[PDB]
Every structure is written in C-alpha cells, then in structure tokens.
Amino acid sequence: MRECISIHVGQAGVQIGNACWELYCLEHGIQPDGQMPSGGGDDSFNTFFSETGAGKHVPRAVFVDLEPTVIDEVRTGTYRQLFHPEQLITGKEDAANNYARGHYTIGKEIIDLVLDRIRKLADQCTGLQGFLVFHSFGGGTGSGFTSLLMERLSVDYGKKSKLEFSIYPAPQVSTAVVEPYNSILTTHTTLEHSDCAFMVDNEAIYDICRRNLDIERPTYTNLNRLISQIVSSITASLRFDGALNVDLTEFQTNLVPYPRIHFPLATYAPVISAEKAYHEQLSVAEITNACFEPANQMVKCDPRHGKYMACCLLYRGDVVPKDVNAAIATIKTKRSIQFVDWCPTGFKVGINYQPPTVVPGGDLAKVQRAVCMLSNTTAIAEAWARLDHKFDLMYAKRAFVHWYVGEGMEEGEFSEAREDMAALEKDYEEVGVDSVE
Amino acid sequence: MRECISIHVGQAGVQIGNACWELYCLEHGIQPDGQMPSGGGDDSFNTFFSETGAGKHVPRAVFVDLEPTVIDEVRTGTYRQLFHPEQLITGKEDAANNYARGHYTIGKEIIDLVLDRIRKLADQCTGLQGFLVFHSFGGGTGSGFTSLLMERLSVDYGKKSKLEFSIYPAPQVSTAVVEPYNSILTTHTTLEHSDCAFMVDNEAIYDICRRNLDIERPTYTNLNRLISQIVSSITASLRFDGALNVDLTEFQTNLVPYPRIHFPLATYAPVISAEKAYHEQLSVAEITNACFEPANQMVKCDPRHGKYMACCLLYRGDVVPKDVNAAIATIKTKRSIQFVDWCPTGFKVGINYQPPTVVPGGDLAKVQRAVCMLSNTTAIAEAWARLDHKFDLMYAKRAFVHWYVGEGMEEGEFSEAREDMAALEKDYEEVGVDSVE
Amino acid sequence: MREIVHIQAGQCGNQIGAKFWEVISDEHGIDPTGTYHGDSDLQLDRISVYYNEATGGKYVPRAILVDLEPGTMDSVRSGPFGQIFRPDNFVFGQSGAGNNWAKGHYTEGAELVDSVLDVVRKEAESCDCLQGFQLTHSLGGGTGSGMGTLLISKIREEYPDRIMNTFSVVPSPKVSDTVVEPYNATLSVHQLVENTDETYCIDNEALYDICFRTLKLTTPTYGDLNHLVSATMSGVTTCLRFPGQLNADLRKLAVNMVPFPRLHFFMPGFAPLTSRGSQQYRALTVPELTQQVFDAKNMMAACDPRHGRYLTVAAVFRGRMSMKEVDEQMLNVQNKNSSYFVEWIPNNVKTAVCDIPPRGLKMAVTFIGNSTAIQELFKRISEQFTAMFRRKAFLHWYTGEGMDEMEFTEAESNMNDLVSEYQQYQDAT
Amino acid sequence: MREIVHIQAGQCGNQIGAKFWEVISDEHGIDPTGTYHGDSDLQLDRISVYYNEATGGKYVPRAILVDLEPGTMDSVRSGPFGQIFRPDNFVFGQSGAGNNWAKGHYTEGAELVDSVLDVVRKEAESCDCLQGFQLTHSLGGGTGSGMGTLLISKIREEYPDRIMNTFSVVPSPKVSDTVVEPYNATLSVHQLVENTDETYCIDNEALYDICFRTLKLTTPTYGDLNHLVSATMSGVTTCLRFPGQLNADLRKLAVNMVPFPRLHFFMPGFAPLTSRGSQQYRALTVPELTQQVFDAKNMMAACDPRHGRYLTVAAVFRGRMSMKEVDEQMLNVQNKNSSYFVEWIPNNVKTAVCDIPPRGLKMAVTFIGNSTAIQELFKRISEQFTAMFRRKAFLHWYTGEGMDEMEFTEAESNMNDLVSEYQQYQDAT
Ligand SMILES: Nc1nc2c(ncn2[C@@H]2O[C@H](COP(=O)(O)OP(=O)(O)OP(=O)(O)O)[C@@H](O)[C@H]2O)c(=O)[nH]1
Ligand SMILES: Nc1nc2c(ncn2[C@@H]2O[C@H](COP(=O)(O)OP(=O)(O)OP(=O)(O)O)[C@@H](O)[C@H]2O)c(=O)[nH]1
Ligand SMILES: Nc1nc2c(ncn2[C@@H]2O[C@H](COP(=O)(O)OP(=O)(O)O)[C@@H](O)[C@H]2O)c(=O)[nH]1
Ligand SMILES: Nc1nc2c(ncn2[C@@H]2O[C@H](COP(=O)(O)OP(=O)(O)O)[C@@H](O)[C@H]2O)c(=O)[nH]1
Ligand SMILES: [Mg+2]
Numbered sequence A, B: 001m002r003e004c005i006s007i008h009v010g011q012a013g014v015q016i017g018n019a020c021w022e023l024y025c026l027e028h029g030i031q032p033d034g035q036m037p038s039g040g041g042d043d044s045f046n047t048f049f050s051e052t053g054a055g056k057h058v059p060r061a062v063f064v065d066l067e068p069t070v071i072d073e074v075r076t077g078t079y080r081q082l083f084h085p086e087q088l089i090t091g092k093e094d095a096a097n098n099y100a101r102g103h104y105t106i107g108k109e110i111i112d113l114v115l116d117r118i119r120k121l122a123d124q125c126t127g128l129q130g131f132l133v134f135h136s137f138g139g140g141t142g143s144g145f146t147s148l149l150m151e152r153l154s155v156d157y158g159k160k161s162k163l164e165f166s167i168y169p170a171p172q173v174s175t176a177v178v179e180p181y182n183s184i185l186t187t188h189t190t191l192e193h194s195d196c197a198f199m200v201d202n203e204a205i206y207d208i209c210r211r212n213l214d215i216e217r218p219t220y221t222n223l224n225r226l227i228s229q230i231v232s233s234i235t236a237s238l239r240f241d242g243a244l245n246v247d248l249t250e251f252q253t254n255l256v257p258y259p260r261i262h263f264p265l266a267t268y269a270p271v272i273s274a275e276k277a278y279h280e281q282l283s284v285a286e287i288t289n290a291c292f293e294p295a296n297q298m299v300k301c302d303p304r305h306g307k308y309m310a311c312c313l314l315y316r317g318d319v320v321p322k323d324v325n326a327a328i329a330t331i332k333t334k335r336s337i338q339f340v341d342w343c344p345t346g347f348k349v350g351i352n353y354q355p356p357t358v359v360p361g362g363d364l365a366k367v368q369r370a371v372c373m374l375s376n377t378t379a380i381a382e383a384w385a386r387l388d389h390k391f392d393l394m395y396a397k398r399a400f401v402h403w404y405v406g407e408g409m410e411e412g413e414f415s416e417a418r419e420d421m422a423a424l425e426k427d428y429e430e431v432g433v434d435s436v437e
Numbered sequence C, D: 001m002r003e004i005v006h007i008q009a010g011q012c013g014n015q016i017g018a019k020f021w022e023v024i025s026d027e028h029g030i031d032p033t034g035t036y037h038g039d040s041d042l043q044l045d046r047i048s049v050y051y052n053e054a055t056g057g058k059y060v061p062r063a064i065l066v067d068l069e070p071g072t073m074d075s076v077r078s079g080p081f082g083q084i085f086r087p088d089n090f091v092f093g094q095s096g097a098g099n100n101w102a103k104g105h106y107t108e109g110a111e112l113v114d115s116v117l118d119v120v121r122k123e124a125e126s127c128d129c130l131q132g133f134q135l136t137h138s139l140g141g142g143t144g145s146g147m148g149t150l151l152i153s154k155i156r157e158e159y160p161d162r163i164m165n166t167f168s169v170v171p172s173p174k175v176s177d178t179v180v181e182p183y184n185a186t187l188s189v190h191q192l193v194e195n196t197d198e199t200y201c202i203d204n205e206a207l208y209d210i211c212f213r214t215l216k217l218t219t220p221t222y223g224d225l226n227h228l229v230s231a232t233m234s235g236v237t238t239c240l241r242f243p244g245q246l247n248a249d250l251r252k253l254a255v256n257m258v259p260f261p262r263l264h265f266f267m268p269g270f271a272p273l274t275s276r277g278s279q280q281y282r283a284l285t286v287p288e289l290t291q292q293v294f295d296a297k298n299m300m301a302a303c304d305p306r307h308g309r310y311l312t313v314a315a316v317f318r319g320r321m322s323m324k325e326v327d328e329q330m331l332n333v334q335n336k337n338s339s340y341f342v343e344w345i346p347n348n349v350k351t352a353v354c355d356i357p358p359r360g361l362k363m364a365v366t367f368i369g370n371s372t373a374i375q376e377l378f379k380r381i382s383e384q385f386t387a388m389f390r391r392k393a394f395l396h397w398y399t400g401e402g403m404d405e406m407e408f409t410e411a412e413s414n415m416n417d418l419v420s421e422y423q424q425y426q427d428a429t
C-alpha cells in the first residue's frame, strides 16, 4: 500500500544499512535466511520488504559502492541470504575520497545499472512514498555518487520524497583531509534535489556513548545501532499502526520551512545503560526533557547558540497523548530553549504503540517508552561556518585541487559551491532574525 | 656466469699468480690436480675457473714470461696439472730489465700468441667483466710487455674493465738500477689504458711482516701470500654471495674520480700473528681502525702527508652493517685522517659472508673477520716526485739510455714520459687544492 | 580485484622484495612451495591482489625481479622462497651497472627494458583490475636508480592512469655506501618527481638507530631492516588484502597525501617495535602506539620532524582497535603538536583501520607522514651534489655512457626548485 | 734454451777453464767420463745451458780450447777432465806466440782463427737459443791477448746481437811474469773496449792476499786461485742454471752494470772465504757476507774502492736467505758508504738470489763492482806503457810481425780517453 526504497552508498551507507536491516529483521521477526518462522506485523512487514511466493522476503534495498570489499563483507555475512544477489551492486575501483572521481569518472559507468535496478524496485510498488539514502559527506564514493544519484532521481521520479541520512563531518576530528572539499561539493549538489537530510556526527555519538551508556571505547557497530534506532523510530509510523501516524510527505511539510533549509538534527532518547536503567523511571516527561538537552544531540552543535524552527517528536511504546501534551507545553514554556517568533507552533507529534526492540548483545537498555526527536534549528549555521572556513583555508592555496581537476571538473565549480554555501549561511542568519513587527 | 681473465706477466706476476691460484684452490676446495673432491661454492667457483666435461677445472689464467725458468718452475710445481699447458707462454730470451727490449723487440714476437690465447678464453667466457693483470714496474718483461699488452687489450676489449696489480718501486730498497726508467716509461704508456692500478710495496710488506706478524725472516712466499689475500678479498664479492656485492665496474666508478688519477693503495687487516691473536678481540672497530693507520699500508707513503679522495672497504666474514657503519662514521669524524672537501662521501662499503681461509703452513692467524681497504689518496704524489727525481738524476747524464736506444726507441720517448709524469704530479697537486668560493 | 604489480630493482630492492614476499606469504599462510596452508578464509578472499592462482592451488606472486647483475636474483632463487616465483619473471642482464646512473639508465637500460616491459605487460593483462604498481629500489645505487627511472618513465608512458608507488632507500648524513650516491640520488629524484605518485623514503641509519634504541638488537643484519620495511609495506597495503572497519586503498592514500603534484615524498614508520624484555612491562594501547609513531625517534628517516612542519599524515591501524580512542589520541596529538602542523590544512590526519593484525600481534600501526623536514634531506643531497659537481669529480664516467652535463645541471635546477617549493609553505602564513 | 759458448785462450785461460769445468761438473754431479751421477733433477733441468747431450747420456761441454802452443792443452787432455771435452774442439798451432801480442794477433791468428771460428760456428748453430759468449784469457800474455782480441772482434762481427763476456787476469802492480806486459795489456784493452760487453778484471796479487789473509794458505798454488775464479764464474752464471727467487741473466747483468758503452770493466768478489778454523767461530749470516764482500781487502782486484766511487754494484746470492735482510743490509751498506757511491746513480745495487748453494755450503754471494777505482789500474798500465814506449824498448819484435807504431800510439790515445771518461764521472756533480 505504501512503500519505501533504501539506497545505501559508500562504506558508511552500507555498514549503517547492515545495522538497519539487522534491526528491521529483529523487529519484524524475519530470520537472516529471510523466512518468517511465525497479526499486525504483516502490514508493517510489507512496507520495507518485497514478498515472494515461496515465503522468502527480500529487502527493498540497493547497496552500491565503487569498491567491492565492504559489499563482499555483506555477501559473506549472516544476512547474505536476505538480500537479492543482484541488488548488491559493486564497482571495480574506489573513489579515493575524491568527489570528482566518484561523481564524474567512475560513477558514470555504474549509475545506469543502479538507476535500472531502482526502476525495477519501483515498478513492483503499489504506492511509493519515496527514497531513503545513506551515505557520508566525507567519503568520495558517498559524496560523488549520492550527488549524481540524487540529481538523476530528481530528474526521473521528481515529486516523490527523497530523504538522506548523512554523516556530517565532525567538528574537531576527521578521518580524511579532503573532507571539506567533498562535503562542500556534495551539499552544493544536494541543496536543489533533496527534500530533507538528517545530519549525524561521529564525535557527538562518541560523546553520547561515553556520557550516558557508560561505555568507554565504542565502535562503528554501536554507532550504526543508534542510527538504526533513529531510522526505525522514523519509519515505525509507516510500518506499525499508531494513535498519531506520520508520513514522509508530512515530514517534509512540517520540518522544512523554506526549500533550502531542510537539515534537521537527529536525536534519540532514552539512551541509558542497562545498569543505570533500574534507578531511573524513564517517563514521558523525563525522556522529553532528555531530548532537548545539548548533551544528547547527535550533531556537535549547541542549540543554545541558535533557535529552533521546526521540532518533530516520534514517541513509540506505552505513551498517552496527555503526557506528551503536558511535556511539550512545558518545553515550549522553558526560557533556556528558544524558538523563532515566526513559528508559533514549532512541534509536530507522532505516537505509535510498538516499543523498540533491543538487539542481542546491545548496550541500549530495554524500555517500554522511546522518543526520536528531529530538530531543524539554526545551530548548524555555526557548523557550516566552520566548514566554509576550512574550505577557504584549503582552497586559497589550491591545497588538493589538482586531484579533482584531473578527474574532470573546473575551479569554477569549486567557486560556485562556495558561493552557494555562502548563500546558505546568509539564508540561515536571515531566518534567525526576529520579525520587524 | 661473470668471468675475469687473470694475466700474469714477468717473474713477479707469475709468482704472485702461483700464490693467488693456490689461495683460490684452497678457498674453492679444488685439489692441485684440478678435480673437486666434493652448494654455494659452485657459482663462486665458476667465476675464475672453466668447467670441463671430465670434471677437471681449468684456471682462466694466462702466464707469460720472456724467459722460461719461472714458468718451468710452474710446470714442475704441484699445480702443473691445474693449468692449461698451452696458456703457459714462454719466450726464448729475457728482457734484461729493459723496457725497450720487453716492449718492442722481444715483445712483438710473442704478443700475437698471447692475444690469441686471451681471445680464445674470452670467446669461451659467457659474461666477461674484465682483466686482472699482475706485473712489476722494475722488471723489463713485466713493465714493457704489460704496456704492450695493455695497449693491445685497450684497442681490442677497451669497453671492459682492466685492473693492474703492480709492484711499485720501493722508496729505499731496490733490486735494479734502471728501475726508475722502466717505471716511468710503463706508467706513461699505462696511464691512458689502465682503469685502476692497485699499488703494492715490498718494503712496506716487509715492515708489516716484521711489526705485526713478528716474522724476522720474511720470504717472497709470505709477500705473495699477503698479495693473494688482497686479491681474494677483492674478488670474493664477484665469487661468493654477500650482503653488499662490489664488482669491478663499481670499483672503478667509486675509486677513480678522474681518468689519470686511478692509483689506490692496498691494505689488509687483521695482519696479526697467531701467537698474539689470542689476546686481542679483533672486532669490526679494531680492524677498521687498523686499516687507516699509516704503518699497515702496503705502500711506503704516509697518508698524513696527503688527503684521502676515495676509500673502499671490503669486509668479509661475521660482519654486521651497523658495526661497519659506526666504524666508518668514527673514521670520518677523526681529523688526523683527512679527506678532500669536494668528496663529501669518501667511503664505498662492501660486505660478504665468506671469511678468509688460512693457507696450511701460513703465518697469518685464523680470523672470523677480515677487511681489505683500498684508498686513492694524494700521498703517492710524493712517491711519484721521488721517482721523477731519480729519473731526472739518471737521465740528466744519459745514465743508461744507450741500451734503450739500441733496443729501438728514441730519447723523445724518455722526454715525453717525463713530461707526462710531470703532468700527472701537477694533476695530483691540483686536485689536492681545497675548494674556494 | 584491485591488483598490484610488484617490481624489485637493484640488490637493495631485490632483498627487500624477497623479505616482503616472506612476510606476505607468512601472513597469508602460503608455504614456500606456493601451496596454501593458512587457516582464515579472508586470506583466500583477497589473494588475487598480489598472487595469481596457478593450476593445482599453487599461488605464484605477481612479482617481477630485475637486476643487471645475477647475484641477488640467484640468491633469491636458491633461497627458501625461490621456488615461489615464476622463472620467466627472473629477467636479468649480462653485465652490472656498476654504481653508474648513466650505465643503468641508457646503456644496459635500452637492452633490458624491452624484456621487462613485456613481463610487466603480461602481468598487467593477467590482472582484471589494475590498481597501482609498487617498485622497490635504492636511490644510491647505479642499477636501482637507473633501472627504476627508466621503468617508471615507461610504465607511466604506457599506463598513465594508474597510480605509481615506490619504496626508496635514501642516503643519510653520516653514511655512504657508494662514493657517487649524490649523483645517482639526484638524477633519480629528478626523474621520479614528475612520474611517480608516491615515494616512501627509508633510511638505513634511521633503521639502525631504531634497532638499537627500541629493539635493543646487538647485531641487526640487513634482514631485520628488510623485516621493518616489509612490515611497513604489509601495513600500507593491508586495506586491499583484508576487510577493515575503515578501509583506505592506496589511491585514497595518494589523493589524501599529495596536495601538490610534486610533493609526494613521505616518511614511513611503524609501531610497536619493543624488544623482548620490554613487552612484559609495557601495556600495548592505542595512546602508546600513537605517541610512539608520532615520536621523532621512531621515524625511519633521519630528518627530525620537529625542524619542519607537517603537511598530511596517514595512520593505517591494524588489529581489533577502537575507532574513538584513535580519534581522541589524534586530537591530543594535533592539540599538543599544533605548532608542528601547517595551519592552511585544517585537519592533517587520514585515519584507516583494519581488523586483521600481523604476526599474531594484538595491535599494530603503520605511519606515513608528508612532513616538510624532508627538505633538509634534499638540501643535504643537493649540497653534496654541488660540492662534487663544482670539480666535476666523477662526471667523465657518466659522460662516457652518453649523457651530457646539461642533464646534471637540469637535475640540480629541479632539486633547487623542489627545495624552494618545500620552503615556501614553511614561509607561508 | 739460453745457451753459452765458452772459449779458453792462453795457458792462463786454459787452466782457469779446466778448473771452471771441474767445478761445474762437480756441482752438476757429472763424472769426468761425462756420465751423470748427480742426485738433483734441477742439475739436469738446465744442463743444456753449458752441455750438449750426446748419445748414451754422455754430456759434452760446450767448450772451445785454444792455444798456439800444444803443451797446456796436452796437459788438460791428460788430466782427469780430459775425456770430458770433445777432441775436435782442441784447436792449436805448432808454434806459440811467446809473449808477443803482434804474433798472437796477426801472424798465428791469421792461420788459426778460421779453424777456431768454424768450431765456434758449429757449436753456435747447435744452440736452441744462444745467449752470450765467455772467454778466459790473460792480458799480459801474447797468445791469450792476441787470440782473445781477434776472436772478440770476429765473433762480434758474426754475432753482433749477442752478449759477450770476458774474464781477464789483468796485470798487477808489483808482480809481473812478463816484461812486455804493458804493451800486451794496452793493445788488449784497446781492442776489448770497443767490442766486449762485460769484462771482469782478476788480479793475481789480490788473489794471493785474499788467500793469505782470509784462507791462511801457506802455499797457495795456481789451483787455489783458479778455484776462486771458478767460484766467481759459477756464481755469476747461476741464474740460468738453477731456480731462484730473483733470476738475473747475463744480459740483465749487462744492462744493470754498463751505464755507458765503454765502462764495462768490473772488480769481482766472493764470500764466504773463511779458513778451516774460522768456520767454527764465525756464524755465517747475510750481514756477515755483505760486510765481507763490501770489505775492500776481499776484492779480487788490487784497486781500493775507497780511492774511487762505485758506479754500479751487483750481488748474486746463492743458498736460502730471506730477502728482507738482503735488502736492509744493502741499505745499511749504502748509508755507511754514501760517500763511495756516485750521486747521479740514485740506487747502485742490483740484487739477485738463487736457491741452490755451491759445494754444500749453506750460503754464498758473488760480488761485481763497477767502480771508478779501476782508473788507477789503467793509469798504472798506461804509465808503464808510456815509460817503455818513450824508449821503444821492445817495439822491434812487434814491428817484425807486421804492425806499425801508429797502432801503439792509437792504443795509448784510446787508453787516455778511457781514463778521462772514468775520471769525468768522478768529477761530475
Ligand atoms: N557511523 C558510521 N560512520 C561511518 C561508517 N563507515 C564510515 N563512516 C564515516 O565515513 C567517513 C569517511 O567516508 P567513507 O564513508 O568511509 O567513504 P566512502 O563512503 O566509502 O567512499 P570512499 O571514499 O570511496 O571510501 C568517516 O569519517 C566515518 O566517520 C560506519 O560504518 N558507521
Ligand atoms: N712481492 C713480490 N715481488 C716480486 C716477486 N718477484 C719479483 N718481484 C719484484 O720484481 C722486481 C724485479 O722485476 P721482475 O718482476 O722480477 O722482472 P720481470 O718482470 O720478470 O722482467 P725481467 O727482469 O726482464 O725478466 C723486484 O723489485 C721485486 O720487488 C715476488 O715473487 N713477490
Ligand atoms: N634496507 C636495506 N638496504 C640495502 C640492502 N642491501 C643494500 N641496501 C642499500 O642499497 C645501497 C646500495 O645500492 P644498490 O641498490 O645495492 O646498488 P645497485 O647494485 O646499483 O642496485 C646501500 O646504500 C645500502 O644501504 C638491504 O638488504 N636492506
Ligand atoms: N789465475 C791464474 N793466472 C795465471 C795462471 N797461469 C798463468 N797465469 C797468468 O797469466 C800470465 C801469463 O800469460 P799467459 O796467458 O800464460 O801467456 P800466453 O802463453 O801468451 O797465453 C801471468 O802473468 C800469470 O799471472 C793460472 O793458472 N791461474
Ligand atoms: Mg568507500
């Protein structure tokens, strides 16, 4: 009845996709073989999976990477039987952290096959809600190929929703020197074609894991588990029934005030260790307050440095409307948090009955209540100011431009991307100013 | 695979050749009959010896002398079966210590046969690296026929290396009155055709034997044993495998800066008696320090009277590259040992695994370490000054010119040779000048 | 998938390549006969990167052995792993190069380069996907320098698109294995700077020191030095050979590392390198590894990193290692050593992580650094070159083999340009 | 190979040749019958130098016996070593020369010279490779002087290339066995100086003093004197006959001995020459022998070398000795006697060594000194010649046999030139 397509690009995209499909299989009871060993779960299952007459269930997934090693890891993992063998599409050589390479030279061979398989996936859908995209700005394959794929999908499908779950470059640390160039170019291309992209920060999730879950040396797995929890909370309204159901089109309509300002911040609560879960009640007011602290944001950006303009909360489990209504009135009433005056109603509420499922061996405590908070706010203007400063420092001396020029792009594209990002931050500070009357 | 043709001219050359082929037979395990009674020793063996299908091994040697007595000593000695009977070339009458007689009259009769045998050996040689010539300047046969043979071999095989092992005329001791005439004429003819001539001095080796080996009755058997040790240390890189292999072409490239400055000074350490060998350690540092002392040089020339311009150290046995590296750094740091400023890297290093073999009944001690040091240095400019002064003293009154004129050469040859040696001495004092600006 | 063609020129390159293939076959569980006897399936998964699967399960290396003299190649063929190579790949000339760059490049090079390029071509067509090459050689030698320059130029002529990697053994201030090391070194870098994409500068004195200070080895032969160099090689090329939690292929390394097309000369390193006694006392941790690799005394080039500033740094981690404590320790390094990092690169670190450690060690790290302290090394080599060239001390040997003095002057001019290009970013603000 | 043709002329030459062949056959182990009974193979290895191998193992000496009177050759043929020679080589006339150089040279020479030259030619063609000749003769005699000069001239005509030695028993200051000795000696050296290559001057008085002072012989007959001269012959000609560490042939001796073509007159010597008793007290060493030959009283010519200077010196050692001490003793000699060596010759000594010693002695050395002190002897002979020629005391005997007085004056003028040449280099600086 309502369907979504999840495209996983680059090492980050595919690894987060592995964690995500592990979580969906655990929630719907699908075995890694693909068979259901087992009433309300059937329609919830049908959204993200294509059923076959033999009883096997195939994910509505397209895994793409120009290097074969990570996808071969998937093809050797426990979920090898789950995925369609063809839909794991592999290129022959890596993008080498080069937006130019991934977008122009290497991506152009395999984009046609990727678009053909996305067309085949879309053909078997009754009503396609939209596309889910997973990648990282820093990666060359992720940046270039998600830019190319986003423009091609915007040309082809158009009106249907297109949601990204991108890994924003961390403020202090970075695993790649050319991250500013790759990030600036991909968000330059993404601004026109996207609908709503949800930022994620590795440093922020490390800080969350240390601070709350009381672990000390976390790894990508736990990070991808948290991101999987985010997308599961986001999609549970589509899959499971609920008191207040929310769709991706309504996510666009609520979270996006203007066409270019469509970058909310992910957040989950209650993130809490099993050891400390006993002492705390974890009621609706407690988790709702935990959502809005600066400490538990998954992007290293203090919301106190800016103002919210669109908050959207997705409660799941044993939750009543009056508790959330009182909590949201309280959070609106507080003076620490601040909202733009031109948005009197800055809260979107969604509720559903299914509580989250803890994966085996996970660090998250079992809880009968959970909430996922997505906030469009001006605090990301500071992060893009930092990223623009980094890009300016690199590009003033032409720090790495010859690698990009070799793979077929001009310096005019670099200047145009920087100009577009200047325009973006001017728009952010523009909307951040109060009304004249 | 890689071959070297040994040539032995005059009494000094052939006697040293007897000692040298004795040492090679002892090292490779070849019996004096030519048969090997016996893995890594095979190729090592193939360099200097020619295989025969019956299992006998023939030296790649040409023994030449214009008198038959010494070569008949070879043909009656224990190694009579070893050598090719045809290669042992004997002239009818001696050169009478006369360069003119040995070069022109008696030389022209037998040079064709000598070159024919050398051509046949080279035709057999699969990969020829060069020629090893042994002679003495004082001898008439040696000096004259070596000059004739050197010019002929330069004309024929001028591409390949040519290495002379000449016995320098000693400063104080002597065995001939016309020795300065012979040495000046043969150096004049040899300066153009030689690639590099290693120097040996009977007086220096006498002093070495008396001081270090404590041998109060040193024979020319002992001197030829030491010279055999020198050449075996030089050629062990070609024969045996090693950590750092020095070939003749790189001996030439490292040691010879300019075409006319190609006269290094031989040296071996440890030279030590077996009686005193038990007390001293004989480490890499000690042997390296012993190499650079003035007393242990095989040429009576104080290196402190000049400056080193190219040193080449050939370690053999239980030797560590860190040990030799620290020793060479120490020797570079010392200021009593001086080097030309225009040669910042004055050291060539070669290492190989095979230790030296002590001959039965020898005077040297068995040692697990040995080093052969070869130094091109400006101290021998003093020695050429001495030899030129002696030549001036004799030729100012035409002391013995009538013999050379009778045997077919002009006084223009004497004058031209003196002028060439004056130019050589000038070149040496010129390159001894420190750089300015 | 993602193959590499390996070449080893000169005695130095041949011995290092031999020890590299010992290390690779050891960690992949391949016997010297070429038969597989390892335990992990991941060894077979990426064995095609370096090996070709011959009939009967025999794995031949994708190696090419070049040397104008026979001795090192015969030693390799007689060695325990001499059986593993293809006999046809043993391409070798009839007379050595001496230590003459001119002899290695022009005189014998014109003879042997045809045969070696046929071998390179047959290997390259045997590969379905060709990633970059990997040459081992010494700059100071005649054979290694000349053959490496000619091979590098021709391989870049015929394969312009593919990456080129070289592992070069450079001279030091306090050592000299040959007299003409400045001439050979200078001509080699002049030819390499435009052609190669990455050049890793190993120094013999630095490895000797490392063995003395950290490993406490009393008698380190060249085997231990080649062991360390092979350790760095296996470290850098691990991402193509095993699964990893943050992969980094060598094209990624080149793109991260070469800001400008000529500044591609790097400084390698490795950790842990403790002696037998010290591992009991020390507790191997990511902070310890980071401080060890960022220690100057650990570096395998004699130049001090503190004299210059840093451009780009690469830490390829190996073993089960956390991806947060690496990042925090790189943050502590950047905060403590900010004065040693150029400000116009805001983040200098390229992190990579691989799950499978080497030799059964629990943890390991391979360090690459593009520090500007290599300008001191190039200054030293150019100074020695000018000191000899003022007198033309050894030039007639090079001129006999055909080349002109104008080539020497052009190489000196290009080295001066390179040192100025390194100094201008030190002066930049 | 390297054959020598020996001639003996005069009673003196014949007797010295007889003793010389006795010594040669003794140390080669050949019986007087000519059959070899020696023990060493080295004796037979070089027996061709002096002997022809006749059928049945009989060794015929390559000797030519000449005398115009038959008495001394009949004595030689009747002696124990009469059978050893070939009968055909005994060539003689029926009338002696008395003591007339004119009679020996012109009258009887014109008859006998043809026969002896066909004999010399028959021996010369048998040689595989003919080295130089040797002659024994007396300058004071008529037959020896005249026939020796005639053979020297004609053999130089026929064989100009070959070396040619002579051993002349020169006249003495005090003892004189012939009144016309000045005339005979002067004409003899006038002919010899143009033609010969080496001449060694023996002095019977010097032999008598050597015998009395060193050997202490109370009754030294001519046998002992000829024994010493034969010892010197065997010493100088040893390098062709036996193996040695330094071989010095006769042409080598000529090249080392003769600076200018006319100064070829040498003073020989020998050591050891100790008595019967003194052998027990004296420990024979190379220093002792070197000091003995360089002692003036040991010299076999009456001239004191201290009165002159040494142009060149040669020492042929026999036996076994380390040559370090030969060289150092020669240098101590040169340093102590630096006044007695001419400056314009930088080094005057020509060393040679042979393995096999003579007559079972452990050691021996033979000395040859070309020194300017021989000018004193030539001055004495020229003074006696002028004293007689002023009165023309005995010129009618020489004029009767054909020659003119112009010859006598020419010989005197050539002697004056010779002594002037000898004094010129003493005066040179
Ligand atoms: N949360 C999370 N982040 C990841 C994961 N894998 C990679 N990343 C992030 O991705 C960034 C680097 O870009 P990559 O995604 O690895 O590169 P790529 O998308 O595979 O594209 P290539 O450059 O061709 O490798 C790093 O800064 C990581 O933070 C993952 O599994 N989980
Ligand atoms: N070290 C050493 N030197 C020798 C030996 N034999 C001869 N000499 C040297 O040779 C010099 C004399 O010249 P020779 O080489 O003997 O003469 P030649 O080369 O045979 O030429 P001719 O004399 O004409 O036959 C002497 O000064 C010796 O130093 C030897 O066996 N060992
Ligand atoms: N690390 C290492 N360096 C070596 C080895 N063998 C030689 N070298 C170096 O190589 C240099 C000699 O140059 P080389 O390549 O042998 O000369 P070529 O024969 O012309 O190739 C010396 O400076 C040595 O330091 C080795 O096994 N390991
Ligand atoms: N050494 C030596 N000298 C001799 C001998 N016999 C004679 N003389 C010398 O020879 C000189 C005589 O000359 P001689 O040759 O006999 O006259 P000839 O008859 O014309 O040949 C005398 O002065 C003797 O001193 C001898 O047996 N030995
Ligand atoms: Mg990737």
Ligand SMILES: [Mg+2]
Binding pocket: B010, B011, B067, B139, B141, D247
């Ligand atoms: Mg000789």
